[PDB]
Amino acid sequence: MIEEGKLVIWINGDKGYNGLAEVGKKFEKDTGIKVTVEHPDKLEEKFPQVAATGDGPDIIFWAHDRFGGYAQSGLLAEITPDKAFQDKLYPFTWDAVRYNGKLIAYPIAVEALSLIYNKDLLPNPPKTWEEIPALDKELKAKGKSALMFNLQEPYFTWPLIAADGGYAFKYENGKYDIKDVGVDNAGAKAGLTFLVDLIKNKHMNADTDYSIAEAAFNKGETAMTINGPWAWSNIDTSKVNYGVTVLPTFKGQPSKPFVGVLSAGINAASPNKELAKEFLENYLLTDEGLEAVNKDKPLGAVALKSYEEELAKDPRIAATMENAQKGEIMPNIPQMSAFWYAVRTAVINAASGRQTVDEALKDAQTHMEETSPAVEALENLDPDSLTPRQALEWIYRLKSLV
Amino acid sequence: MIEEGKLVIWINGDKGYNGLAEVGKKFEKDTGIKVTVEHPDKLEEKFPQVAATGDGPDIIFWAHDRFGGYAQSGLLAEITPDKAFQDKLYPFTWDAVRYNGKLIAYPIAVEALSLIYNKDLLPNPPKTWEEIPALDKELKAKGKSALMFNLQEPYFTWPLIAADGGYAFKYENGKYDIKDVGVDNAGAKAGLTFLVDLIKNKHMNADTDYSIAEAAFNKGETAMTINGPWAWSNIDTSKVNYGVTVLPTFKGQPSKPFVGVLSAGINAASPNKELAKEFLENYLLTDEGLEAVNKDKPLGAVALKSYEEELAKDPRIAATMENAQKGEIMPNIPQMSAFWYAVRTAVINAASGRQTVDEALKDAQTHMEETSPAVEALENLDPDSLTPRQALEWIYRLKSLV
Amino acid sequence: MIEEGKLVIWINGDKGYNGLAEVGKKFEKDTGIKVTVEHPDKLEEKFPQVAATGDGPDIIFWAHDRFGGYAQSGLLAEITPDKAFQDKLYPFTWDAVRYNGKLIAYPIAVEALSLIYNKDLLPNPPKTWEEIPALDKELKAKGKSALMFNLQEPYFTWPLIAADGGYAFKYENGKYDIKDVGVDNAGAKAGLTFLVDLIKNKHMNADTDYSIAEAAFNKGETAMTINGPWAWSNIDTSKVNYGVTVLPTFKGQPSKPFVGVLSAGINAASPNKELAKEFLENYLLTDEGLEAVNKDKPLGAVALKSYEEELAKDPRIAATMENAQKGEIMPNIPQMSAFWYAVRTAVINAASGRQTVDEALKDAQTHMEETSPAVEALENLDPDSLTPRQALEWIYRLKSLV
Amino acid sequence: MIEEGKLVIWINGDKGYNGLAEVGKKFEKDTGIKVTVEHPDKLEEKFPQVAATGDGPDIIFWAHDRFGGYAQSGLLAEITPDKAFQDKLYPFTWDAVRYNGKLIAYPIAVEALSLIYNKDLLPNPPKTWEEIPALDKELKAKGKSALMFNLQEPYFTWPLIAADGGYAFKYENGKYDIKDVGVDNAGAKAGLTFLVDLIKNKHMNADTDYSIAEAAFNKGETAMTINGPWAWSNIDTSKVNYGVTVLPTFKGQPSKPFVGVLSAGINAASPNKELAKEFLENYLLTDEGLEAVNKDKPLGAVALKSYEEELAKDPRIAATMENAQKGEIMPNIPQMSAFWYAVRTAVINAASGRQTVDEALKDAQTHMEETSPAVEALENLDPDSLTPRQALEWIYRLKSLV
Ligand SMILES: OC[C@H]1O[C@H](O[C@H]2[C@H](O)[C@@H](O)[C@@H](O)O[C@@H]2CO)[C@H](O)[C@@H](O)[C@@H]1O
Ligand SMILES: OC[C@H]1O[C@H](O[C@H]2[C@H](O)[C@@H](O)[C@@H](O)O[C@@H]2CO)[C@H](O)[C@@H](O)[C@@H]1O
């Protein structure tokens, strides 16, 4: 519904979208404007697909890394908070949503992965990845496991892969050298080899995903998981006595998570840009709107200073920020898209044994060094959801990309 | 689509297509099968576009260099001539139409560019590229120019670009290394600089194309042109007293044109491939059949031994084969269209001043380094000719190439 | 396009097109001219779309009501049969194909809908629409329904809509007043309310279409259907013991179907109009030629006198002509497609509950009041099938209609 | 150039576009952002044509009557002046640019037509239209004429046509009855008949246009003209001693000009919406920016109160506002488009004698009563400037309009 007079909002299924709908319901009450909160699959790839043809939602929620590609494709309206409102949010969150000198999204919350452990099974969890094998051997004799976490999304494995020196793009003086990529280097090989060794040695399963790992931790079947603050409420529900701590170190060096700022952008094709701004600034980015959402699924360390002053006292948030400090804020450059695509394939191929670690990371590097809109776009395009008219605009749009 | 019981043939506009239809009419009269000869513009692009879908002609004529890409795209039937027929043609012409061990077309005639000169204006044509400036200077007084030829198609400029060392792809053993490209080497630079200098120094105009150069020569306005046998008949209609001879040398080395073998491929989707086979084998590739086309526009050095014995007595044909010998048969690899794209841009951009020679030839190199099945097919389609449903099929077809 | 020396024919999918091709094969054997019989979906729309451009078949078969619009768009050749041939067909069938004094098609057969009933389930079929509810009530016990017929095409619902006074356009003198429309009068309302009430009261389902109603009858699941002669052969294959009879009365008045004359028009752009003329005149419109089609699917009451003398002995044909007499030959004016559009929406919207009967029939009226050449052609094209260049031609073609 | 990083501005050729470019030059100097001011032909019909396909300028200048159609077609961004800036402009100018509760453009200036007369030829010009014949008879004996004004644009004749009761749409309580149109009524017939009588009697020429009338007044060939403030600077240049006064009355009732507010909207497809706003609010709508433009071609009675306080003392401005008071502020409803289209045709057809006054105004009414996007759009479409891709989006856009 690219309907004027309405707001349509997209956000990932793991965030507090019932919470957000409650904020929509306060906006409809005060204003009469209906808000529909939807959480469709793969929405970070659908958005650029349908916004290109002037469709999609008024408001898109995602971590900030995808937004520079959006802004570059002219898919986002420039947001114009006054100084009084900008002063409400931590300066480094605004930096994460600035692209080519324009603010292209409102920052909502800072996310980092942490080690979450069952204190009943494991009151003193391991400081190192290298201890996990022996600890799994121990828990196996009891029909349990040391560690389960989503191995389907490179976001979850990247902190291990980066530990010993893997990187996406080289950061120098204020700028990413997109010709300097480090997914194929010795440090990235070391961390992926360690992961694959865990599966080879039957300490993890290659096919473990988000939901398999959540159920296992939440039922008492595995001692540890890796996950971000959004996950904590399902763990409360399970009554498991859990702690949130620093990720284990690897080769005597910290795991270095990629730090994401959940952000909200306004589709540049939206006929509702003023309503979107009123909803975001006046309803969502308040102690009340952030609480509604956070009480649903935890946001992390929110962008809003007044509300953050409270949540910062939560030792789980302390631990999140501790982990964020060891990792790095994601780049928002357009190539992040190619980075994730490449690494996802490499991790799955290495984990399942279809490829060696060496073969996998060298194709991931080759894929990144071969990134260019026209083959790349074809790679992110889902034609099963293109109408003939959308496919034609896309054939032009791709002739011109070029 | 394409209907059974009839043949549709496509052949380029500069070829003897009325001659060709004379052969078709003999065929319908003997056979009861109607032959429709068509000469659509940009056919070497239109072909891959419509044959992809199982439409297009039964028979396609073009120089052999496009046929590798068409065969790789599954568009051509492997042809099936017996040994006795194969014995009738020259083995080198069969090599030009062999792709991964398969015969993908019937060769027709060998085409090389020669220097064509007006014997009244210039009875002793230039041995070297280097003397042409002074000659143009001298012709100016008479209201004439030294030389005009098509600068819009890199085919006509290649011979000079290659003379001092430019090459498409390195040929070491039996193979073409697609990684080792020679459009940007010292010889390619020196050849193109000499062309640009001809333009800078007002001896040629960047804008000159096929029809412009042809009019000027045939109207006795320019002393020389560079063209292939198909042009001789318009010259003859013109009564210009012309000769055909070896291209001039550059830095003391022959001009090296890229030699094409005009070939007929059978569309893989054609229901008439036996009919195609009988027409081509028993009608076209005969003394009688080839004479009818060559009498419309000359074909060059024909592939069929018995007829070439005749043609080869003609000094314009010895001139053609001299140039052919000095140049190189074109590769037929999929990557040739990428080559020709890249070089077409370089020549037009350098001739126009839009780029230096070094800038233009670097960009030609980079482009060839970044080719792939997907983008080559893309260089091939214009969206202006695709329906939305077709575009949607193209998005899938494109995806399957990535 | 369209090639000389051959015929391409389009005929609707529910007709005897294999029979028709049998006539074509006799024609090729006598004539040496190949006949290609095609039955594309939505042909009565696809025809105006491709014939506008001078493409499409040589011959088009449809009921006469579409032929006024096709002739007005300059798409049909005026046919040229001599008096002796014209004497062979019935004068009323020639009137159906006359437009502004010109013969625009050869009539083939008269089509009217009848009540078809299962003689085992219902040996005495209902005289009146009004009794069908109680009959359905009684059939329910047996696991059967009273009546199922296509509710998606207003052709099948019109007979009841017209019974009590609905009409398309008023016919006073010799002419149809396009200003005086009768889709929204008291009789049209009463007829449609009775259909909607059948649905409200669970005696029919809004969703029922051609193939659904056909399966149900032919599988012995429903006692009655409403359909034309073309359906009888599937019923026969079915061994259902069926009869064909007069439609039931409504408010004491005959059902009045809109009677079509299945006709063949010659495409104005066809290069084979003498061949079309010889096939139609001397092959199709013969005892032998019509028997071959009618043996595939029955044609109805054929236009050719000598063959109808035979067919008319068949009680299913007397039933057809009874219904034909009680209903009205369709006008052939350009405005008939607008009529059918308008009523198709009304019936579907009323049957679905989306609109009351009064709302739906008012909107049908308004629509017909607002028709024009431009928007009628628009109801005809789908952009999904137009290339951009074609679309541009359509914008001009459309402008020339305003 | 839908280039981000640039502003492209469209404004009519009769406004001070050299002036406006000087404001662009101050914006480029202070900001580095290039501004291109263009004045293309028929820009009020091109804008909706090219903005529909995401092309056109960042900023469009036109009188406010066209903007409600634009806003309705989703072609305009909502503008969001703060209260401090809105307070700078007269409240009634903001009303003129509000559509469906959104401000859709910045108001610049109020325009009304006045009677401009040569005080040397005619020190006491006529209070009535009915005096013009005798006064022309008098000036003719001297090789001069009473009155010449653009008869090609209904804007110039509408005040006479409305005098005795012609109207576009009936205005009641706060709303236009679009079903109540008055171009065919007795008052509109009376004023058009008077115009046509002037031409019949050789007092005016049907073909006199803007430029013919300007030259004539400006050279001393005609005593009077009708025109808005933009025209006054060319009259200064001519040194003609002119006055600006109330339009003559007709049938003892005032001429009732349609009053236009020159406005500036921001294309909703612009990637430069923030720059556009900075330029409009901060550079143009200042005493300095308005003066730059006004010193070029007079704007009328500007929207900006501080600058208006000065120009209001100009007796020419007093006379403009006197005339505005007798006429009416144009509606901005989407149907204004159809209104002008209809009346333009009627005036030209009546003036040239191809149609009687009665025939002309009744077709204009019939055209208005038949207004609907799909025939209407086809009427405003210029396909000579559509690319194939633009034409396809338009065939969809029009299928959907609907
Ligand atoms: O795995 C690649 C993927 O990782 C990140 O996505 C995170 C997201 O940021 C979190 O909020 C949560 O949803 O987990 C996701 C991983 O499943 C990047 O944000 C995303 O762009 C990237 O593709
Ligand atoms: O200019 C690039 C072009 O060169 C060759 O085309 C020749 C063709 O072989 C000749 O038969 C003649 O028609 O002139 C053409 C150039 O105008 C290659 O065969 C072709 O693939 C390539 O694009």
Ligand SMILES: OC[C@H]1O[C@H](O[C@H]2[C@H](O)[C@@H](O)[C@@H](O)O[C@@H]2CO)[C@H](O)[C@@H](O)[C@@H]1O
């Ligand atoms: O439903 C509207 C439709 O009715 C008629 O079409 C009939 C056709 O005449 C018969 O031959 C048979 O095939 O069924 C069709 C309906 O499914 C009109 O002839 C047609 O123009 C109209 O749109």
Ligand SMILES: OC[C@H]1O[C@H](O[C@H]2[C@H](O)[C@@H](O)[C@@H](O)O[C@@H]2CO)[C@H](O)[C@@H](O)[C@@H]1O
């Ligand atoms: O004539 C119909 C036309 O009139 C008005 O246009 C005016 C414009 O407002 C003035 O600023 C000046 O340019 O003269 C124009 C008439 O030529 C309406 O503004 C316009 O929409 C309408 O079509």
